């Protein structure tokens with residue numbers, strides 16, 4: 001749960017999106033227990049990107065070793081309630097682009113956001129990840145949450161980077177306008193342990 005001031009800040013930051021502009025959505029974790037969400041507007045580079053601590057541990061451990069490589073300890077300090085707070089304040093009758101719409105449709109429906117429509121780009125597996133290596137080379141710094149060795153040894157899946165590479169595959173080039181986060185780190189994470197005095 002967010003505070004009154006955190007709520008005002010998020011809504012204010014979210015209004016930076018153009019409600020009509022092309023907007024991607026991607027998620028890591030199952031739709032009833034998501035761990036990473038990304039909403040991205042390729043034209044202006046703006047993105048909403050946050051995390052969530054999981055409730056089902058056994059699945060999470062499976063998803064960590066075979067998909068996202070996230071260590072659960074790195075999620076202990078993330079701000080709770082962001083998933084419902086974000087989804088609630090997305091514009092009325094918004095349209096979202098995505099790769100595989102099944103899970104995202106379930107997630108939006110669970111939030112009573114049936115008014116939000118999805119466009120599944122439905123690319124083939126490898127066509128969607130053509131520019132995976134280049135996107136990781138350039139934008140790895142944007143998300144350091146994928147620390148574990150993933151096996152299917154492969155590149156971990158990041159909700160954010162997946163949006164960027166899906167846009168890249170659609171346009172045919174890894175050349176996109178610079179991605180910029182719309183959320184402050186102080187909203188995504190809880191102030192962590194105090195600095196070790198050195």
Ligand SMILES: [Zn+2]
Nearest residue numbers: 143145158159
């Ligand atoms: Zn990530």
